[PDB]
Design a protein around this nucleic acid. Structure first.
Ligand SMILES: [Mg+2]
Ligand SMILES: [Zn+2]
Ligand SMILES: [Zn+2]
Lengths: 50, 136, 98, 49, 118, 488, 461
DNA sequence: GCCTTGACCCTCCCCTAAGGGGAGGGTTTAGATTGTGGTCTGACGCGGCG
DNA sequence: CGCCGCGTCAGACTGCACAAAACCCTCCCCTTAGGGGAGGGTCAAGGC
RNA sequence: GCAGU
């Protein structure tokens, strides 16, 4: 909208092309991460964690 | 659902003759818990006639019922919603008392939903030769 | 589980189902009879319009609660517009007169 | 494979195992059920069955 | 009272009813009143006892009846009858999201029907 | 705003006046790019733009020019919300009987024509003829004929008389009939009839005919020549996140109708034999009748799960229809739920409300009190403060619940004391603390029962919770005048 | 209704096909009675001598492709047109015309150029019927009289209003009222008679040609009906093999019926092959094309349908030979397509779930009431937008009205559109780069932490 | 000793036109193929046959 | 009148886990060049 | 479907 367009014009913080869709702990849940499994489709290059 | 108390009085003179519920030999509901809260439809008078015990259009609260059991009156003609002259609703006199508050009912009370809930709430508590006079 | 606002349903604009979808409690039919047995006409009306379905009305309600003004401007619930459009998709002309 | 697959995965009698404690499993395996394909429907079963 | 809510005309009188048709009892009562006010003798009727289902489905408001059960029959009868529903009870005002005509919404409806009448 | 809801039959002119264009093709969307296809069941040109203030070719993209019909694609530039309001239509190549006015007993087409429903279902399933005009011939106006009897009548009488089959014939019979004349004739033969059964049949037919002449309806509107198309946002085709789509059964039924209709137009152009076009007219009739009410005539259509398709009539009726599931009761914002425990320290007007439930139920109240008291400069700052749960939002939360009642409800709400208001006392648990004396009113024991909490927002709602529903006003029962807030 | 038609023998199909062929070549002779069609045949014959189009879709052969028959025997028809063009000197010309017909007997014609010819003939038909209906309801909208008295004088005149001299002789007021019509038929009554001799033949006898055409064409279409209605069992026997592949049973048999009508009007019996072997090809084509087109909610093209079918067949054989579902990186090497094409094909082939699908066999719930509306705006974001409007309005009220309106005018603030510098240059009576500097002035002014402390909280963290 | 208004030149960005290629719709095939596939509910009201 | 066939109905809230092919032809999308426009960089004049 | 009230 024009107001946040002006807001971008004043401060200069250009919005990013990506949206945060990360996995977060559900609210109220508190615990320890005890296992992480990464399943990668064949052909996709594995990250350092995989 | 659409039965609301919409008037203060329809001026009718009809009403049911409330009597105690006597199934055979014993009473199951006295006159007191049957007329408590109604308004009378006619002048209740003592068994000795010509002196009106309770006046015509009176709400029978607990003091008036105590007066009805001091004397021995056993049939009181009260006003009911089946005999209300009000069209599209019910007058506040033909209903009687609002049982939750204890006074005559206000204009605007949704008495049909209250009646339907009050009947169908106990529904889960329901299921699925010669005569010998007992006393004097 | 509790919600103030959140995700709403797609066809009808009512809140979603359960605490996994951030919920909203079904104020069903017997509870509407409970609010009709009291004279709670405004509580009932705000349960119908500006908490479930009045799409222009629930945003106004939020901005009024935030701006310190506990007042509603209820409109027609969107489920009733869905109903008028689904009756008209049969060969039946249902209307609103004035 | 589709017949066997739909029976084992999506039948009414092939149920997600109740795995709370050992007793839950050992009594979910000894379960008998009048419902299911070829059985009753819980809404149309009278007081006598 | 809500069960014995209809009547059948046995004598049409000086009125716009037919013998053997089931009319709302309040309608025929007020029609007889406004006829007797002008000297013409009104209709005579016999009250009917309907069940709570057959009386719920026989209301003069098709929104309540279509909302209750047998939506298809009620909607076809109301369509071919060219019916009109004035939102007078509680369910038709809950369906459309209005104040109910009972309780704290009774003053609002008295204002609304005394200012949309004159 | 409005004072009444009038229901009537929809003229084909009325059906064409609602619609914003004809759905000529069964295309829902394009498979490569999920833009909706032209002249289809989801058509941005017919049903409105799929995005806010943006035509489907992207040539016009802002509300600088709104209300503009683009020329590269015919999409108006307006809100996408109009896809919930804009209907379309289908021009049926053959007149099709409405299933509601044919099959819901007593049959209105049958009751109106004085014709048994077996005869009408045989005429409009192309199993018999019917003589829509007798002329100077012994053939009467409701006389059904077999195929060979019609051939014999054509031998003996030629092209003088008129006889047809299918819903075209029923429509010609409903159109040719005179309503006031037949009504007064039935009144005459009701005044001279003493058979009570015939008097009952005659008076119900007379009330039907006079209900038609008093309303604006015409009888032949019971035979659909135009069919409405629901707005596509009410039968949505939405992509699930897993790449797969999810559609309503209405798209399958509409797509079936349009396929059979376009094939009927094809056959009528190809001059196909009468066996094929009769079978196609029967299929179009049964597809429209499966769209309106599935399973009402014979076998229900089941698609791709071997489960019957949900028709238009099934959307609005039953325990899962709109009327009972979305209009008389509905899911509600500002509502929470938790287990109930005793809290015998409470007063009759108090409940115990968890701090983590009351911080969510009263979120805009806390946002507004953080904005007002200067503790937050914005609603985004106040949202972050409530999210981090600073020590000041708990003081704000103690401020905003002070005299603010909440309604507590234990379903099944058997009577009106199954919803009562209480002032919340912030407790640290996760379970509601319900006063002991009110338990008998709720039929609530603390063996796992849960209760929903609702927040009354407006000043009227708060004052009804305080004046009408508060548990101190509820100490007598409304069924009998006896106490219900009673020791136990 | 279908079993009440008896099947055909091998010789019955021959008889029906010969009835069809006799109907169509006699109706083609009936349009050959119209010699403008002869002129068109001969001018496209000279264009064949220039090879405007190919001969196979000009001619299919000749009955008692080789092109040298057509050239010289169309020259023979040209000599026949020569001997009929001038040999009228009108009682001796009436033999050469049916000689034209039965020397045209040996001709075969294609569907499409004959479709051009019959659309010209239907223009002729529409002209004839609209002129005769002009004659019909130009007088009866003026008069009230049974018009058989006026048709009895019309048939045969065809040149002028000499048949109107005895119209008034009845002296019953109809021809009195026809007085006022006796003029305005003028440019009608001659103009048809113009083209009458441009096509050479009289309006009444070309009406006879039109009705003989209608008789012959209904004779052809009657026998096209018997061949379709007899082979309707073949459509069912074929369509029962496609039953659960996306369409209903009746939809399949109706599309196969369309294919069978196509086979019937594309069948010729002179090849000596049985009709069922031809109709089977056409019915298979129609039914599979219908399944490819209208069996899916999100319709995919017929080439992608063929691709998905080949993929399913190949994966079926691979599963049968190696006992497991093949990976797309071996399914792509048993086929010869790239692996990402196999991946997108496998992503395409899925059908949409119904939103009334119950979740975990739970009937009171469905798939439809877990799907949220993502296009909505959160009311916190609506409150954020209205608060940002208020904050921006105040922090631009803290400026000079000129530059504050420059900013409200350059962005879309309080206005339906935003304006570029030239627009406002025409508006503010100021050159472009000066008001550009004014905008930069106000932006540098608002970047200060004096006023921009509330606005910065509208930026994310 | 320091601020506007142009002034000229420079730089990049978005709309437009065209060309290649993938895509998608279309037409045609000629040995004979001739009619497809759960039942587990009881009570109540009604309406047409007989 | 008896009877058979048919239509309508059967509590409310919560979680949990969840779902033939081959060849022709035109048409639309991706890519790229271009051109116009729309800001951006660095100064020349009085004015402040 | 499986549980809770
Ligand atoms: Mg309990
Ligand atoms: Zn009264
Ligand atoms: Zn556009």
């Amino acid at each position: 909208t024009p107001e946040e367009k002006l807001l971008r014009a004043i401060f200069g913080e250009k919005a990013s092309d990506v949206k945060d869709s990360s996995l977060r702990v559900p609210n109220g849940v508190s615990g320890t991460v005890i296992d992480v499994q990464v399943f990668t489709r064949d052909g996709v290059e594995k990250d350092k964690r995989a | 659902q659409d039965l609301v108390v919409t008037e203060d009085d329809c001026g009718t003179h009809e009403g049911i003759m409330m009597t105690p519920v006597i199934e055979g030999g014993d009473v199951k509901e006295p006159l007191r818990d049957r007329v408590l809260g109604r308004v009378t439809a006619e002048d209740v008078l003592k068994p000795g006639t010509a002196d009106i015990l309770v006046p015509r259009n009176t709400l029978l609260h607990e003091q008036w019922c105590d007066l009805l059991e001091e004397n021995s009156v056993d049939a009181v003609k009260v006003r009911s919603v089946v005999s209300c002259d009000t069209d599209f609703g019910v007058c506040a006199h033909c209903y009687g008392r609002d049982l939750a508050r204890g006074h005559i009912i206000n204009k605007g009370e949704a008495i049909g939903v209250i009646a339907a809930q009050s009947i169908g709430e106990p529904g889960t508590q329901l299921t699925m030769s010669s005569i010998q006079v007992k006393n004097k | 589980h509790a919600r103030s606002t959140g995700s709403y349903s797609l066809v009808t604009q009512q809140p979603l189902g359960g605490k996994a979808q951030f919920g909203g409690q079904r104020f069903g039919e017997m509870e509407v009879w409970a609010l009709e047995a009291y004279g709670a006409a405004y509580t009932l009306q705000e349960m119908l319009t500006v908490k479930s379905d009045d799409v222009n009305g629930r945003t106004k309600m939020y901005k009024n609660i935030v701006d310190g003004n506990h007042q509603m401007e209820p409109g027609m619930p969107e489920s009733f517009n869905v109903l008028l459009k689904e009756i008209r998709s049969l060969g039946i002309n249902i209307e609103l007169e004035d | 494979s589709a017949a066997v697959k739909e029976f084992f995965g999506s039948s009414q009698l092939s149920q997600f195992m109740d795995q709370n404690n050992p007793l839950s499993e050992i009594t979910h395996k000894r379960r008998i059920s009048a419902l299911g394909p070829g059985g009753l429907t819980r809404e149309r079963a009278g007081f006598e069955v | 009272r809500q069960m014995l809510r209809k009547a059948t005309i046995v004598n049409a009188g000086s009125s716009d009813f037919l013998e053997g048709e089931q009319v709302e009892y309040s309608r025929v009562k007020i029609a007889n009143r406004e006829l007797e006010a002008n000297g013409k003798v009104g209709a005579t009727y016999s009250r009917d006892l309907l069940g709570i289902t057959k009386a719920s489905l026989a209301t003069e408001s098709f929104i309540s009846a279509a909302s209750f059960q047998e939506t298809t029959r009620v909607l076809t009868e109301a369509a071919v009858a060219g019916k009109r529903d004035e939102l007078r009870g509680l369910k038709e005002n809950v369906i459309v999201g209005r104040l109910i005509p009972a309780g704290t919404g009774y003053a609002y409806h008295q204002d609304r029907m005394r200012r949309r009448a004159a | 705003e409005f004072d009444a809801i009038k229901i009537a039959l929809a003229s084909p002119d009325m059906i064409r006046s609602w619609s914003f264009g004809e759905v000529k093709k069964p295309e829902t969307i394009n498979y490569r790019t999920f833009k909706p296809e032209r002249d289809g069941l989801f058509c941005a040109r017919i049903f409105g733009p799929v995005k806010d203030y943006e035509c489907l070719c992207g040539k016009y993209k802002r509300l600088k020019h709104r209300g503009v019909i683009c020329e590269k694609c015919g999409v108006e530039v307006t809100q996408t919300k109009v896809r919930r309001e804009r209907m379309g239509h289908i021009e049926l190549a053959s007149p099709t009987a409405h299933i509601w006015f044919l099959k819901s007993l007593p049959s209105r087409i049958g009751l109106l024509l004085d014709m048994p429903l077996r005869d009408i279902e045989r005429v409009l399933y192309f199993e018999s003829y019917v003589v829509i005009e007798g002329g100077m011939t012994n053939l009467e106006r409701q006389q059904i004929l077999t195929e060979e009897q019609y051939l014999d009548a054509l031998e003996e009488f030629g092209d003088e008389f008129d006889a047809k089959m299918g819903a075209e014939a029923i429509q010609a019979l409903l159109k040719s009939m005179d309503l006031e004349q037949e009504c007064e004739q039935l009144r005459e033969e009701l005044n001279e009839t003493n058979s009570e059964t015939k008097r009952k049949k005659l008076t119900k037919r007379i009330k039907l005919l006079e209900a038609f002449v008093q309303s604006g309806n015409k009888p032949e509107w019971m035979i659909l020549t135009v069919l409405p198309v629901l707005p596509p946002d009410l039968r949505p085709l939405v992509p699930l996140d897993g790449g797969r789509f999810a559609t309503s059964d209405l798209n399958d039924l509409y797509r079936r109708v349009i396929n059979r209709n376009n094939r009927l137009k094809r056959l009528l152009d190809l001059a196909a034999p009468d066996i094929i076009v009769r079978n196609e007219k029967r299929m179009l009739q049964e597809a429209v009748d499966a769209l309106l009410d599935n399973g009402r005539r014979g076998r229900a259509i089941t698609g791709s799960n071997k489960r019957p398709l949900k028709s238009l009539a099934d959307m609005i009726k039953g325990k899962q229809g709109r009327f009972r599931q979305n209009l008389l009761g509905k899911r509600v914002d500002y509502s929470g739920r938790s287990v109930i425990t005793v809290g015998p320290y409470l007063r009759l007007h108090q409940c115990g409300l968890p701090k983590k439930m009351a911080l969510e139920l009263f979120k805009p109240f806390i946002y507004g009190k953080l904005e007002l008291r200067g503790l937050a400069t914005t609603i985004k700052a106040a949202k972050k403060m409530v999210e981090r749960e600073e020590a000041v939002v708990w003081d704000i939360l103690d401020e905003v619940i002070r005299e603010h009642p909440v309604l507590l409800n234990r379903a099944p709400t058997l009577h009106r004391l199954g919803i009562q208001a209480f002032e919340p006392v912030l407790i640290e648990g996760k379970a509601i603390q319900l006063h002991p004396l009110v338990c008998a009113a709720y039929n609530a024991d603390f063996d796992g029962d849960q209760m929903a909490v609702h927040v009354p927002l407006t000043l009227e709602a708060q004052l009804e919770a305080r004046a009408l529903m508060m548990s101190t006003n509820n100490i007598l029962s409304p069924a009998n005048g006896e106490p219900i807030i009673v020791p136990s | 209704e279908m079993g009440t038609v008896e099947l055909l023998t091998r010789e019955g199909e021959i008889d029906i096909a010969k009835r069809i062929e006799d109907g169509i070549n006699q109706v083609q002779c009936s349009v050959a009675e119209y010699p403008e069609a002869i002129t068109y045949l001969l001018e496209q014959y000279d264009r064949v001598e220039a090879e405007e189009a190919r001969l196979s879709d000009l001619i299919t052969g000749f009955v008692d492709i080789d092109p040298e028959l057509a050239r010289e025997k169309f020259a023979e028809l040209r000599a026949q047109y020569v001997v009929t063009r001038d040999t009228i000197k009108h009682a001796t010309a009436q033999e050469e015309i049916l000689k034209l017909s039965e020397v045209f007997k040996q001709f075969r014609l294609v569907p499409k150029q004959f479709d051009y010819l019959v659309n010209s003939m239907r223009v002729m038909m529409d002209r004839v019927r609209t002129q005769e209906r002009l004659i019909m309801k130009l007088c009866v909208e003026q008069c009230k009289m049974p018009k058989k008295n006026f048709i009895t004088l019309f048939t045969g005149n065809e040149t002028s209003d000499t048949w109107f001299n005895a119209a008034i002789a009845m002296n019953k007021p109809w021809s009195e009222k026809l007085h006022d019509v006796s003029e305005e038929v003028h440019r009608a009554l001659q103009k048809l008679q113009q083209i009458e001799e441009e096509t050479g033949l009289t309006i009444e006898q070309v009406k006879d040609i039109n009705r003989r055409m209608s008789i012959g064409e209904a004779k052809a279409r009657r026998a096209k009906k018997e061949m379709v209605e007899a082979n309707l069992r073949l459509v069912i026997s074929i369509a029962k093999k496609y039953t659960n592949r996306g369409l209903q049973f009746l939809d399949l048999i109706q599309e196969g019926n369309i294919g069978l009508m196509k086979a019937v009007d594309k069948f010729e019996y002179r090849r000596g092959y049985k009709f069922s072997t031809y109709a089977t090809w056409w019915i298979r084509q129609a039914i599979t094309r219908s399944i490819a087109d209208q069996a899916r909610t999100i319709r995919i093209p017929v080439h992608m349908i063929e691709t998905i079918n080949k993929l399913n067949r190949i994966s079926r054989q691979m599963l049968q030979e190696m006992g497991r579902e093949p990976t797309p990186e071996e399914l792509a090497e048993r086929m010869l397509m790239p692996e990402d094409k196999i991946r997108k094909v496998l992503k395409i082939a899925k059908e949409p779930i119904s939103m009334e699908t119950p979740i975990g066999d739970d009937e009171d719930s469905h798939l439809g009431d877990f799907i949220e509306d993502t296009t909505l705006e959160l009311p916190l974001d609506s409150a954020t937008t209205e608060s940002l409007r208020a904050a921006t309005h105040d922090v631009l009220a803290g400026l000079t009205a000129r530059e504050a309106k420059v900013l409200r005018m350059r962005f879309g603030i309080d206005m339906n559109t935003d304006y570029t510098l030239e627009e406002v240059g025409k508006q503010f009576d100021v050159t472009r780069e000066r008001i550009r500097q004014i905008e930069a002035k106000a932006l540098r002014k608002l970047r200060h932490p004096s006023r921009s402390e509330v606005l910065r909280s509208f930026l994310d963290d």
